[model samples]
Target: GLSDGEWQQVLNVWGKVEADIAGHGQEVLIRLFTGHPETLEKFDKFKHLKTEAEMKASEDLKKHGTVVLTALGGILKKKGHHEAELKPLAQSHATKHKIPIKYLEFISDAIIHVLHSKHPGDFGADAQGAMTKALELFRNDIAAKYKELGFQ
Candidate 1:
């Protein structure tokens, strides 16, 4: 479990990532609400912010909190196993909804990376560390490409 300070840091980083992605022209907030309806409900309670509001307000913390919790809920719904299976499913849904696979992968990887980093001391330390490292490298690669396109 994250202490208050830790949770705040999570929110801070999440907010920044959310803003960055949103600025890149992805309707991430809308997708988040539509993609995981049940998780959005729980996030409203946990994060104390509406999905639309977070996106519109550009409140990165709220957006991050929502995305992280929603991702966890998605993970939990799959019996808390087979995350690799979940990714393709999520990607397919995004494709069906006309979301670019590139953006979806970016958002998913970012959420996973943030979760791993925030809880490195938890029970799944090894798994979290490995996942975080992998995602970090992926994020950097994508970021370089994004930079080439003039994204900040």
Candidate 2:
């Protein structure tokens, strides 16, 4: 439950990056793979990529990153008002996709890292706090769905 002010702060930063969702999303995924190569193996589409340049230039990476960030952007745009929309997303990842909660944490961190890297001026203390909590809430909501469906 974000306070109204917190929602505003989160949206403020989100707005700065949402326009180029796929572009920024690609950066987020690339950052995740760069920081955690093991996690890259989890994605069948991108596991074959061996170099940072290849990863950056990957079309599959961009496509999937767009999907990932679009989902995340929807959460911020809606301001946590639509947990139900995440159920199918959570179930698919938990069952067929098989992403553990830890990888999700890394993705979350990658998202924030990209944000801070790109917009240091916009992500001050309050914005950081708000964005962190907002991402945590999204993670927990999906994690709870994983629990409900009997996956880790």
Candidate 3:
């Protein structure tokens, strides 16, 4: 669990670095899809969009991105809520999405990379540490189902 001050630092950094969630989300998706095509195979909706531009322009992609990033933003705002994601966010993803556990790592890394790259000069260690812990918690929660399913 993050200390209260760290949580605020995370929120402040997230807002500072990702003032444009929509834009950052798009690029994050693109990075995920372009480099790792198999990751797209996990999503019935995204698998058909074969190109970076296609994924970028996809309303479906945009919508999911908003939901994902929004949920993440919510957790960042209210610390430790990611553990609560065990069911809806984590378990169901394993059962329904059939994604590998490492899938979460890519998205987490992508979001952080984008947040830092887009605003390279914005975040401090406190904010970075906060975001890092937040992503780890979220990923850990989300991976619960994946592990239960024995996915490697």
> Which candidate comes out best when scored by TM-score?
2
Q: Could you tell me which residue pairs clash in candidate 2? A: none
* Residue pairs that clash (backbone atoms under 3 angstroms), model 1: 15-60
lDDT of 2 by residue, 1-152 (tens): 89999999998888877788888988999999999998988878788899999988888888988888877788678888876778878988898989998998998889889988887786799988998999899899988888888887
**Model 1 accuracy (lDDT, Cα):** 0.45
Q: Give TM-scores for every candidate, taking all chains together and pairing residue i with residue i.
A: 0.30, 0.94, 0.85
Per-residue C-alpha lDDT of model 1 across residues 2-86, encoded as one tens digit per residue: 3344434444434444444433223444455555554344334334555565555655644555554455334433332434645
Angstrom error at residue 80, model 2: 1.7
Residue 100 CA error for candidate 1 (Å)? 1.9
lDDT score for residue 41 of model 3: 85
Instruction: Provide the overall lDDT of each model, using Cα atoms, as 2-decimal numbers.
Output: 0.45, 0.86, 0.74
Model 3 Cα lDDT, one tens digit per residue, 1-152: 77888777877777753577777777788888887788888888788897777887798787777777777777666577655645666656766666666888888888777777877877666677888887887777666656776766
lDDT of 1 at 29: 40
Model 2: per-residue Cα lDDT at residue 22: 84
Per-residue lDDT, model 2, residue 124, is 93
